[PDB]
Amino acid sequence: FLGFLLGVGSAIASGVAVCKVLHLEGEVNKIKSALLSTNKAVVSLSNGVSVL
Amino acid sequence: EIVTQSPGTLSLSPGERATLSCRASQNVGSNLLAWYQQKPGQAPRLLIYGASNRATGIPDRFSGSGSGTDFTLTISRLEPEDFVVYHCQQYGSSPRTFGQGTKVEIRRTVAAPSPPSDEQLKSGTASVVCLLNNFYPREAKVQWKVDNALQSGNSQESVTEQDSKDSTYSLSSTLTLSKADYEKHKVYACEVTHQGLSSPVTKSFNRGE
């Protein structure tokens, strides 16, 4: 089995980056206000990424 | 949170460019500003969302711009159907707050303007009317005259909407006085200002038919 030739990635690197972005000032307040009249909305974070 | 619109009424000829302003007390979060168009007596239609993105099916003559405190809705060239009211809403914070609204009206050439009753007096109170007609510049009927004297708080004004193919029409002014005041005097004069005319018209109101 040639599995020892495989690389080493970081599975949740992208998700952890979004977690760190969510800790910035006003990010949670932005999400809370966006989810006021609906259960599902698109929010643009401080780093320019739009996340459902 | 306060979001006030400017100006109250916009007077522009058809095919001209319209610019409507909407300012806010504080910065609107994420530039979450929407523009709605509302025709007389029906539900608002969404024009702009996100302060710059126009909704589905909206003609590209409607555009939005601005940031922070100040936002602007531009109509590149007004169609006849565009002379309606326009509202701005903020939804970057709770509660969501709208604006007072802005009226866009057809601008045109300046105007073309074209005693007490018995039964009512017999019935007690009386109401003298000072009526006008097809006129454009929004100033119709100003003051009353009861035996060469001005009064306040006993008259009510009520205007119409702009016409379909002449963009005109006029206001009704009703002066209400009880039976003790209608028969106490014998003249009900009136002075109008800037009717697109020369002098106040038909100011003779002798008590009787």
| Both structure tokens of A19 | 């977690």
By the 8 A CB rule, do B25 and B3 touch?
Answer: yes
By the 8 A CB rule, do B173 and B160 touch?
Answer: no
Q: Do B30 and A36 touch (CB under 8 A)?
A: no
- A 10 A CB-CB count for B108 gives 17
Tell me how the structure was determined. X-ray
Residues of B in contact with A30 (CB under 8 A): 29-30
β-strand B18-23 against B70-75: which pairing, if any? Answer: antiparallel
Residues of B with CB under 8 A from a CB of A: 29-30, 92-94, 96
Q: How far apart are CA B87 and CA B4, in angstroms?
A: 10
Q: How far apart are CA B73 and CA B87, in angstroms?
A: 10
| Both structure tokens of A6 | 């495989």
By the 8 A CB rule, do B193 and B139 touch?
Answer: yes
Kindly tell me the sign of the dihedral angle through the C-alpha atoms of A39, A40, A41, A43.
positive
| Both structure tokens of B142 | 């100003």
Q: How far apart are CA B40 and CA A1, in angstroms?
A: 75
Q: Do A36 and B92 touch (CB under 8 A)?
A: no
φ/ψ of residue B74, rounded to 5: -120, 135
Nearest to B78 by CA among B178, B156, B10: B10
Q: How far apart are CA B69 and CA B125, in angstroms?
A: 52
Q: How far apart are CA B80 and CA B145, in angstroms?
A: 40
- Is residue B50 classed as helix, strand or coil in its secondary structure? coil
Residues of A in contact with B94 (CB under 8 A): 33, 36
> What phi-psi label fits residue B86: left (phi over 0), alpha (psi between -120 and 50 degrees) or beta?
beta
Q: Which class for A16: exposed (0-12), middle (13-18), buried (19 or more C-beta within 10 A)?
A: exposed
Residues of B in contact with A46 (CB under 8 A): none
